[PDB]
């Protein structure tokens, strides 16, 4: 029957050549043997792999729009990507060249991605991870396995499947290996230890995730396509949460809608309270851990059904990891509210002054709350630049020449770096001088000067994110920060009064 | 087996080894560990080509027309390239020199690489020694460890076929 198993298949010569002699050296050889089963077992190989199967391509870019669209809410930027990709290898005929690569933060997307391209082009998936074993063993009984591609093409039973090399950044000699593997003048020649029959794997689509592009192999990079894959802000969280999270840990469970209901505004205070990362790894545990104390609950009988609400997910997940993120809700005239940028979201602070002496030689300035040396300059540079513009503007105060004043930025364990919050300190600097607070929902992040000017500044989005989560109003930003202030989706930005400023007289003008 | 030599002009010395591995070759069993050790060995002495050179054109205007076509600017290159076909003329001989270009990311330290093996004729080998950290991805392994592949170097003459292949060491 090895004949039926690839009759009505297309088959290649030097691959029936190999099939027939194996088939006359086992009719040689004698049967139920320590020599018979080897054989056996390699033209079976031989029959298994499919040499003329394919899959017809979907070409058409509204049906992988469509496919894409359904699963993986948001991802719009990757989603152009894709299919631009898709574009360009319908006009170009083929698909082969570059190979994509995903990379961001963990647990945001970059294998379901990899699973949902797979159904687009109607291509077969299959992930094997390379975090030598990827050539097969030789047949001295050894290793009686070919090697992990030549499984795909088994299992997939398609010449053109879609392959993910999941966590390439992992791999351990393996990156010349895949560096000849990726290649499409390589590919048509894929000769395997296990069998010495080459295959054409010049229709296969190669696919590779990671999270930092600082792997070892640097020509990698030149044939690899980087696509870099953002985090979450919470609406998006909520709403992957509420469509593809909490159906999948449910059915996990055991349980259904109607037994345990997780509300809309449950979530919110979940994702708001407990996770803060840039992905959904940690809200995916946070859902499975209530469902599992409500599974508990519903059969050892202290309900028969389960409704969780604001007031009591601590007694499922215990207690809040984050706070209320305002230490002031009215600000005294000394202190000022600055933003800084994590790399696990955006953080709103604050910048306290006051006199450490009596009466308001020169003074001097005492600054504390672990401060590095590029925010210690900034604070020497916003002294010195307080002090003239208070000169210019108010030339009969003689605070800030004669005082002095102890500059802390609470929290005072946490280490703070960073040039910004230079308009801040001016601004806690001439606010404490002139004894008049702020304007009260207002926050500032800019670069200045030693002459005025308002130095552009990095994480705008993160810090944007958590002043409008702390309540803030009305956000002043560097001019030179527009286009990243406008590169934000219309909800994030929808109720700020934002300012964009290059000197700070009009910071001045805006805070008092 | 000895066919693959029979084209190549093999050293004495590396002929006394692919004599003595064929005797433990054929004094040694099937489907034993040390047959297949012995035969990657002589397959991989068997695959360097031990006494070819490719051909060179030492043409200067046709390799000149091939620099200036595929690049801009750049005249140091193009003119210590020049150089090097003229001194690979008087000398007779295909010769080989050690250079380097340093400059800003992004303006053709990489590419004129290839252009030039292109206008030389000769092969083409790029690997980087950005990363690595231990010596055995260049000089190999040991014919006795477990896992066991000749390095990087070897590798590059054997896929090229040549003695003098242009080898570009990135980074
Ligand atoms: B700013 O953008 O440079 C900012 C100044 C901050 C003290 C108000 N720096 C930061 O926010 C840093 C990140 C950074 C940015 C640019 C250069 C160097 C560092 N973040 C923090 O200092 C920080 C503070 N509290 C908690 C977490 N991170
Ligand atoms: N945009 C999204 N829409 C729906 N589900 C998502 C989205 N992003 C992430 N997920 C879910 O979160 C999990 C992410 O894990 P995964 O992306 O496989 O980890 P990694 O990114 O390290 O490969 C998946 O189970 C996926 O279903
Ligand atoms: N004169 C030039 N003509 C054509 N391409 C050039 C030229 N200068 C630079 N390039 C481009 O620069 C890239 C190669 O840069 P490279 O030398 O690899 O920089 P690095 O190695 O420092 O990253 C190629 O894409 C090449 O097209």
């Given at each position: 029957?090895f004949?039926?198993?690839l009759?009505?298949?297309?088959?290649?010569?030097?691959?029936?050549?190999?099939?027939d002699?194996?088939?006359?050296?086992?009719?040689?050889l004698?049967?139920?043997?320590?020599?018979?089963?080897?054989t056996?077992?390699?033209?079976?190989?031989?029959?298994?792999?499919?040499?003329?199967?394919?899959?017809?391509?979907?070409?058409?870019?509204?049906?992988?729009?469509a496919?894409?669209?359904?699963?993986?809410?948001?991802?719009?930027?990757?989603?152009?990507?894709?299919?631009?990709?898709?574009?360009?290898?319908?006009?170009?005929?083929?698909t082969?060249?570059?190979?994509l690569?995903?990379?961001?933060?963990?647990?945001?997307?970059?294998?379901?991605?990899?699973?949902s391209?797979?159904?687009?082009?109607?291509?077969?998936?299959?992930?094997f991870?390379?975090?030598?074993?990827?050539?097969?063993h030789?047949?001295?009984?050894?290793?009686?396995?070919?090697?992990?591609?030549?499984?795909?093409?088994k299992?997939?039973?398609?010449?053109?499947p879609?392959?993910?090399?999941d966590?390439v950044?992992?791999?351990?000699?393996?990156?010349?290996?895949?560096?000849?593997?990726?290649?499409?003048?390589?590919?048509?020649?894929?000769?395997?230890?296990?069998?010495?029959?080459?295959?054409?794997?010049?229709?296969?689509?190669?696919?590779?995730?990671?999270?930092?592009?600082?792997?070892?192999?640097?020509?990698?990079?030149?044939?690899?396509?980087?696509?870099?894959?953002?985090?979450?802000?919470?609406?998006?969280?909520?709403?992957?949460?509420?469509?593809?999270?909490?159906?999948?840990?449910?059915?996990?469970?055991?349980?259904?809608?109607?037994?345990?209901?997780?509300?809309?505004?449950?979530?919110?205070?979940?994702?708001?309270?407990?996770?803060?990362?840039?992905?959904?790894?940690?809200?995916?545990?946070?859902?499975?851990?209530?469902?599992?104390?409500?599974?508990?609950?519903?059969v050892?009988?202290?309900?028969?059904?389960?409704?969780?609400?604001?007031?009591?997910?601590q007694d499922?997940?215990?207690?809040?990891?984050?706070?209320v993120?305002?230490?002031?809700?009215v600000t005294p005239?000394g202190?000022?509210?600055?933003?800084?940028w994590?790399?696990?979201?955006?953080?709103?602070?604050?910048?306290?002054?006051?006199?450490?002496?009596?009466?308001?030689?020169?003074?001097?300035?005492?600054v504390?709350?672990?401060?590095?040396?590029?925010?210690?300059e900034?604070?020497?540079?916003?002294?010195?630049?307080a002090?003239?513009?208070?000169?210019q503007?108010?030339p009969?105060?003689?605070?800030?020449?004669?005082?002095?004043?102890?500059l802390?930025?609470?929290?005072?364990?946490?280490?703070?770096?960073?040039p910004?919050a230079?308009?801040?300190?001016?601004?806690?600097?001439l606010?404490?001088?002139?004894?008049?607070?702020?304007?009260?929902?207002?926050a500032?992040?800019?670069?200045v000067?030693?002459?005025?000017?308002?130095?552009?500044?990095?994480?705008?989005?993160?810090k944007?994110?958590?002043?409008?989560?702390?309540?803030?109003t009305?956000?002043?930003?560097?001019a030179?920060?527009?286009?990243?202030?406008?590169?934000?989706?219309?909800?994030?930005?929808?109720?700020?009064?934002?300012?964009?400023?290059?000197?700070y007289?009009?910071?001045?003008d805006?805070?008092? | 087996?000895?066919?693959?030599?029979?084209?190549?002009?093999?050293?004495?010395?590396?002929?006394?080894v692919?004599?003595?591995?064929?005797?433990?070759?054929?004094?040694?069993?099937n489907?034993?560990?040390?047959?297949?050790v012995?035969?990657?060995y002589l397959?991989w002495?068997?695959?360097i080509?031990?006494?070819?050179?490719?051909?060179?054109?030492?043409?200067?205007?046709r390799?000149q027309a091939?620099?200036?076509?595929?690049h801009?600017?750049?005249?140091?290159?193009?003119?210590?390239?020049?150089?090097?076909?003229?001194?690979?003329?008087?000398r007779?001989?295909?010769?080989?020199?050690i250079?380097?270009?340093?400059?800003?990311?992004?303006?053709?330290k990489?590419?004129?690489?290839?252009?030039?093996?292109?206008?030389?004729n000769?092969?083409?080998?790029?690997?980087?020694?950005?990363?690595?950290?231990?010596v055995?991805?260049?000089?190999?392994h040991?014919?006795?460890?477990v896992?066991?592949?000749?390095?990087?170097?070897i590798?590059?003459?054997?896929k090229?076929?040549?003695?003098?292949?242009?080898?570009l060491?990135?980074e």
């Amino acid at each position: 029957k090895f004949r039926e198993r690839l009759k009505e298949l297309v088959v290649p010569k030097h691959v029936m050549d190999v099939v027939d002699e194996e088939l006359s050296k086992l009719g040689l050889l004698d049967n139920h043997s320590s020599e018979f089963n080897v054989t056996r077992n390699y033209l079976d190989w031989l029959t298994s792999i499919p040499w003329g199967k394919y899959s017809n391509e979907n070409l058409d870019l509204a049906r992988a729009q469509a496919v894409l669209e359904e699963d993986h809410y948001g991802m719009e930027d990757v989603k152009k990507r894709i299919l631009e990709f898709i574009a360009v290898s319908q006009l170009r005929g083929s698909t082969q060249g570059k190979i994509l690569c995903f990379y961001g933060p963990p647990g945001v997307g970059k294998t379901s991605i990899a699973r949902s391209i797979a159904r687009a082009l109607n291509r077969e998936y299959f992930r094997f991870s390379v975090g030598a074993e990827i050539k097969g063993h030789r047949r001295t009984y050894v290793g009686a396995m070919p090697g992990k591609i030549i499984q795909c093409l088994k299992k997939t039973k398609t010449e053109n499947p879609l392959i993910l090399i999941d966590e390439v950044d992992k791999i351990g000699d393996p990156s010349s290996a895949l560096l000849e593997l990726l290649d499409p003048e390589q590919n048509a020649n894929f000769l395997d230890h296990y069998l010495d029959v080459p295959v054409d794997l010049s229709k296969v689509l190669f696919i590779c995730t990671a999270n930092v592009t600082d792997t070892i192999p640097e020509p990698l990079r030149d044939r690899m396509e980087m696509i870099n894959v953002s985090g979450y802000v919470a609406q998006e969280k909520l709403a992957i949460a509420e469509r593809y999270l909490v159906p999948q840990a449910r059915a996990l469970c055991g349980l259904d809608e109607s037994k345990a209901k997780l509300s809309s505004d449950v979530l919110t205070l979940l994702i708001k309270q407990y996770c803060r990362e840039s992905g959904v790894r940690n809200l995916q545990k946070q859902v499975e851990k209530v469902l599992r104390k409500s599974a508990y609950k519903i059969v050892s009988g202290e309900a028969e059904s389960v409704e969780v609400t604001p007031e009591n997910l601590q007694d499922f997940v215990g207690k809040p990891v984050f706070t209320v993120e305002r230490m002031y809700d009215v600000t005294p005239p000394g202190v000022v509210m600055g933003l800084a940028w994590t790399a696990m979201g955006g953080s709103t602070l604050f910048v306290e002054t006051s006199l450490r002496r009596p009466q308001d030689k020169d003074g001097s300035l005492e600054v504390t709350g672990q401060l590095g040396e590029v925010m210690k300059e900034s604070a020497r540079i916003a002294y010195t630049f307080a002090r003239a513009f208070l000169m210019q503007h108010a030339p009969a105060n003689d605070y800030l020449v004669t005082s002095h004043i102890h500059l802390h930025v609470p929290e005072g364990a946490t280490p703070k770096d960073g040039p910004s919050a230079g308009c801040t300190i001016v601004t806690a600097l001439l606010s404490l001088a002139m004894g008049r607070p702020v304007r009260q929902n207002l926050a500032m992040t800019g670069e200045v000067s030693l002459t005025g000017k308002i130095l552009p500044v990095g994480g705008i989005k993160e810090k944007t994110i958590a002043a409008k989560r702390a309540g803030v109003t009305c956000i002043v930003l560097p001019a030179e920060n527009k286009k990243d202030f406008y590169d934000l989706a219309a909800f994030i930005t929808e109720g700020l009064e934002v300012h964009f400023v290059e000197h700070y007289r009009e910071i001045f003008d805006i805070a008092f | 087996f000895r066919e693959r030599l029979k084209e190549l002009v093999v050293p004495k010395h590396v002929m006394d080894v692919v004599d003595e591995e064929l005797s433990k070759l054929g004094l040694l069993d099937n489907h034993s560990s040390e047959f297949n050790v012995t035969r990657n060995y002589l397959d991989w002495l068997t695959s360097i080509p031990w006494g070819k050179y490719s051909n060179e054109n030492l043409d200067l205007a046709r390799a000149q027309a091939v620099l200036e076509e595929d690049h801009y600017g750049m005249e140091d290159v193009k003119k210590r390239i020049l150089e090097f076909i003229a001194v690979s003329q008087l000398r007779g001989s295909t010769q080989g020199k050690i250079l380097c270009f340093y400059g800003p990311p992004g303006v053709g330290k990489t590419s004129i690489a290839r252009s030039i093996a292109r206008a030389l004729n000769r092969e083409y080998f790029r690997f980087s020694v950005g990363g690595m950290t231990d010596v055995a991805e260049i000089k190999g392994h040991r014919r006795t460890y477990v896992g066991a592949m000749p390095g990087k170097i070897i590798q590059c003459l054997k896929k090229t076929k040549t003695e003098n292949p242009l080898i570009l060491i990135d980074e």
